[PDB]
């Protein structure tokens, strides 16, 4: 059997974001002019 | 069998966002002018 | 069988947002002028 | 002056949670028995 | 002066939760038995 | 003056959580028995 | 003046969490028994 | 059997983001003009 | 003046977490028994 | 059997990001003009 | 076991106040004009 | 075992206040005009 | 074992205040005009 | 004339005791045996 | 004239005791045996 | 005239004790045996 | 074993404040105009 | 005239004790046997 | 074993403050105009 | 006129004690036997 503990489980203060889950692609073409 | 504990379960203070779940793609074309 | 505990279950203070669930795509074309 | 753009402003699909804002402390004593 | 844009303003689809605002503390003592 | 762009602003698909903001402390004493 | 671009701004797909902001301390005493 | 503990489980203060999970590709063509 | 670009700005797919920001200390006394 | 402990488990203050998990490729063609 | 003696126990004349116990935060914005 | 004696225990005349116990934060913005 | 004696225990006249105990942060922005 | 402001006046959260006022003496002969 | 501001006036969180006021003497003869 | 500001006035978090005021003498003869 | 004696224990007249205990951070931005 | 600012006024976090005020003498004859 | 004697233990007249204990950081930006 | 700023005024974190004020003498005859 399996006993799995992951993420931020039982943490003390989860003040950062947690990871998402993306099943698909990213096409990115930003254009930045300073 | 499986015993799974994940996310921010049993946390102390989940002040950051949690991860979403996206099943699909992202096409992104931002244009930033400072 | 499965025993699953996730999200912010049993948390202490869930002051951040929780993750949504999006089954579909995002087309994004913002234009920012400072 | 200040021009500030933050958070998930102008995003394309904000499917994850956003960050909260906690002004105070977290005392956490979870006990997990698998 | 200040021009501030934050949160999920002008977003495309805010399907995740947004962050709350907690001014106070969290004492948490969950007990999980699988 | 200041022109600031941060967070996940103008992103394409923010499927992970964003960072919270915690002004206070975390005392954490989890006890895990597998 | 200042032109600052940080975080995951203008990213293509921010599927990991973003960093929080903690102004305070962490006292941690986990006890793990496998 | 397996006893697995990962992520930021049982942490003291998870103020950085956690890792997402991307099953798909990234095509990126940013153009930056200072 | 200053033109600063940092973090995972303009990235292609930010699937790892980003760095938080902790202004305070960490006292840690974990006890692990395999 | 296996007893595995990894990531930033039982850490004291995880203020850096954690590693994501990417199953797919990266094609990158940035163009930077200072 | 523990034998604890604290506060003003067994004192001779407790004419000052004793300490309270506040589990939560204080936001204070007094304005004093002499 | 532990034998602990603290506070103003067994004192002779506790005419000053004793220390409280605050588990949470203080945000303070006084404005004094003489 | 431990024999601990602290605070103003067994003192003769505790006319000053005793120390509190704050588990959390202080943000302070006073403005004084003489 | 006199304008006097003292004590914990206008405070934000007075969780410690305040000082008493003792006009008289203290004779103290505690005997502590651990 | 006089404008006096003292004590913990206008403070943000007075979690320590405040000073008393003793007009008289202290004779102290504790005897501690560990 | 006089404008006086002292003590822990306008402080951010007064978690230590404040000073008392003793107008009289202290005769002290402790005897400590470890 | 340990025999510890600290603070102002067994003192003769503790007319100054005692030290507090702060587990968290201080951000301070006073502005003083004489 | 006089504008005086002293003590821990306008401080950020006064976690140490403040000074008392003793107008009188101290006769001290401790006897310590280790 | 250990026999420890510290602080202002067994003192004759502790009219100065005692040291606090701060586990966390201080960010300070005072601005003084005479 | 006089503009005086002293003590730990406007400090960032006053975790040490502050100085008292003793107007009188100290006669001290400790006897230490190790």
The angstrom resolution of this structure is: 2.9
Chains in contact with chain N (at least 3 beta-carbon pairs closer than 8 A) = K, L, M, O, P
* M5 contacts O11 by C-beta, under 8 angstroms: no
Count CB-CB contacts under 10 A for residue O1.
Answer: 10
P10 and chain M in contact, CB less than 8 A: yes
HSE-up (13 A, CA, CB side) for residue O11: 35
β-bridge mates for residue N33, sequence order: O33
β-bridge mates for residue A18, sequence order: none
* Q34 contacts M28 by C-beta, under 8 angstroms: no
**Chains R and A share 3 or more Cβ pairs within 8 Å:** no
Residues 6+ apart with CB under 8 A from H23: A22, A23, A24, J23, J24
Residues in chain E with CB shorter than 8 Å from the CB of F24 are 25
Alpha-carbon torsion K2, K20, T19, Q23, what sign? positive
DSSP I17: P
HSE-up (13 A, CA, CB side) for residue J20: 30
K34/O3 CB distance under 8 A: yes
Alpha-carbon torsion Q25, G23, F27, G26, what sign? negative
CA–CA separation, C8 vs C19, rounded Å?
10
Residue from I9, E15, D27, K29 nearest F4 by CA:
I9
Helix (H) or strand (E) run with residue R5 in it: strand R2-5
Chains in contact with chain L (at least 3 beta-carbon pairs closer than 8 A) = D, E, F, K, M, N, O, P, Q
HSE-up (13 A, CA, CB side) for residue M17: 42
* Chains Q & S: contacts with CB separation below 8 Å: 119
Helix (H) or strand (E) run with residue Q31 in it: strand Q31-33
CA–CA separation, L17 vs M15, rounded Å?
8
DSSP H4: E
Question: What is the edge-to-edge ordering of all strands in the sheet holding N31-33?
Answer: N31-33, O31-33, P31-33, R31-33, T31-33
Nearest CB neighbour to M20, from listed K6, K19, K25: K19
**Chains G and F share 3 or more Cβ pairs within 8 Å:** yes
β-bridge mates for residue B31, sequence order: A31, C31
Helix/strand/coil (H, E, C) string of chain L? CEEEECCCCCCCCCCCCCCCCECCCEEECCEEEC
Burial grade of C22 (CB within 10 A; 0-12, 13-18, 19 or more)? buried
Beta strand pairing call for G26-28 and F26-28: parallel
Residues 6+ apart with CB under 8 A from A18: A7, A8, B7, B8, B16, B17, B18, B19, C19, D16, F16, F17, G17, H17, H18
Q: What angle do CA M7, M13, M18 make, to 5 degrees?
A: 35
Residues 6+ apart with CB under 8 A from B22: A20, A21, A22, A23, A24, C22, C26, D13, D15, F13, F15, G15
Tokens of D19: 């960050």
Residues in chain S with CB shorter than 8 Å from the CB of T26 are 12-13
N12 and chain L in contact, CB less than 8 A: yes
H23 and chain G in contact, CB less than 8 A: no
CA–CA separation, S17 vs P7, rounded Å?
12
DSSP N22: B
Nearest CB neighbour to Q8, from listed S1, S11, S33: S11
DSSP A9: T
Question: What is the edge-to-edge ordering of all strands in the sheet holding R2-5?
Answer: N2-5, O2-5, P2-5, R2-5, T2-5
The C-alpha of L27 sits at a distance from chain D's nearest C-alpha, in angstroms, of: 8
Residues in chain B with CB shorter than 8 Å from the CB of G5 are 32
Count CB-CB contacts under 10 A for residue R14.
Answer: 37
Residue at token pair 């948390």: C11
Residue at token pair 């402990």: J5
Helix/strand/coil (H, E, C) string of chain S? CEEEECCCCCCCCCCCCCCCCECCCEEECCEEEC
Residue at token pair 């105070």: D24
Alpha-carbon torsion M32, N1, N3, N6, what sign? positive
Tokens of C34: 């400072």
Tokens of R29: 């004859």
Cα torsion for P9, P11, P16, P21, to the nearest 10°? -10
DSSP F7: T
F30 and chain H in contact, CB less than 8 A: yes
DSSP I18: P
* Chains R & T: contacts with CB separation below 8 Å: 117
Residue from E33, F30, D30 nearest I31 by CA:
F30
Burial grade of P30 (CB within 10 A; 0-12, 13-18, 19 or more)? buried
Tokens of A17: 């974001």
T20/P19 CB distance under 8 A: yes
Tokens of H11: 């942490």
Cα torsion for H14, H17, H19, H23, to the nearest 10°? 150
Residue from B21, C23, D13, A26 nearest I8 by CA:
A26
Method: cryo-EM
CA–CA separation, L5 vs D16, rounded Å?
50
Residues 6+ apart with CB under 8 A from O11: K28, L28, L30, N8, N11, N12, P8, P9, P10, P11, P12, P13, P14
* CA distances to D15, E25, I16 from S18, in Å: 52, 29, 46
β-bridge mates for residue F5, sequence order: D5, G5
CA–CA separation, D24 vs E24, rounded Å?
5
Nearest CB neighbour to N25, from listed O2, O24, O31: O24
Tokens of Q1: 């074993």
CA–CA separation, F18 vs G6, rounded Å?
14
Q: How far is CA K33 from the centre of its chain?
A: 28
* P33 contacts O32 by C-beta, under 8 angstroms: yes
β-bridge mates for residue J22, sequence order: H22
Residues in chain B with CB shorter than 8 Å from the CB of A21 are 19-22
Residues in chain H with CB shorter than 8 Å from the CB of J2 are 1-4
- One-character DSSP codes across P1-34: -EEEE-TTTT-S-B-SPPP--B-S-EEE--EEE-
Chains in contact with chain J (at least 3 beta-carbon pairs closer than 8 A) = A, G, H, I
Nearest CB neighbour to G5, from listed I5, I21, I32: I5
* A12 contacts G26 by C-beta, under 8 angstroms: yes
G26 and chain Q in contact, CB less than 8 A: no
Count CB-CB contacts under 10 A for residue J6.
Answer: 11
* A25 contacts H25 by C-beta, under 8 angstroms: yes
DSSP N19: P
Helix/strand/coil (H, E, C) string of M15-33? CCCCCCCECCCEEECCEEE
Tokens of A29: 């073409």
Nearest CB neighbour to N16, from listed L10, L17, L30: L17
CA–CA separation, H27 vs L13, rounded Å?
75
**Chains L and J share 3 or more Cβ pairs within 8 Å:** no
CA–CA separation, H28 vs A29, rounded Å?
6
Q: How far is CA Q29 from the centre of its chain?
A: 22
F28/H11 CB distance under 8 A: yes
DSSP C19: P
HSE-up (13 A, CA, CB side) for residue S4: 15
CA–CA separation, Q11 vs T20, rounded Å?
16
Residue of C nearest to D25 (CA): C13
The C-alpha of Q8 sits at a distance from chain S's nearest C-alpha, in angstroms, of: 5
DSSP B10: T
β-bridge mates for residue S22, sequence order: Q22
Q: How far is CA I10 from the centre of its chain?
A: 17
Tokens of E9: 């303003």
Mapping DSSP to helix (H, G, I), strand (E, B) and coil, where does residue B15 land? coil
F3 and chain C in contact, CB less than 8 A: yes
**Chains Q and T share 3 or more Cβ pairs within 8 Å:** yes
* O13 contacts L26 by C-beta, under 8 angstroms: yes
Burial grade of J20 (CB within 10 A; 0-12, 13-18, 19 or more)? buried
Residue of A nearest to H2 (CA): A2
Q: What region, left, alpha or beta, does residue G12 occupy, with left being phi > 0 and alpha being psi -120 to 50 degrees?
A: alpha
Residues in chain P with CB shorter than 8 Å from the CB of S3 are 34
């Amino acid at each position: 059997n399996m006993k799995h503990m992951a993420g931020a489980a039982a943490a003390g203060a989860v003040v950062g974001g947690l990871g998402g889950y993306m099943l698909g692609s990213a096409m990115s073409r930003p254009i930045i002019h300073f």
